[PDB]
């Protein structure tokens, strides 16, 4: 009533597709942000365009970690 390899794996597996999924996205983030920099922009708007790609970096920076850990879990 304990031990459900089978089941740990789906779940795991479930977070780590998700956890892709999220780093796809802020992958797409990132290259929309750099787009948005080539752009007309004062430097106020530069300012912030950079501060968000910083952030979305270091989110990535995460969940790449956690994906490492996440497949060490399995099984």
Partial sequence: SSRQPVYHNLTIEENIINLKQKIYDNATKIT???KGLQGSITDDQKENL???????????????????????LLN
């Fill in 32 to 34: 929309n942000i750099d």
């Fill in 50 to 72: 950079l501060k968000l790609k910083e952030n979305y970096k270091q989110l990535i920076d995460n969940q790449k970690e956690q994906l490492k850990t996440y497949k060490n």
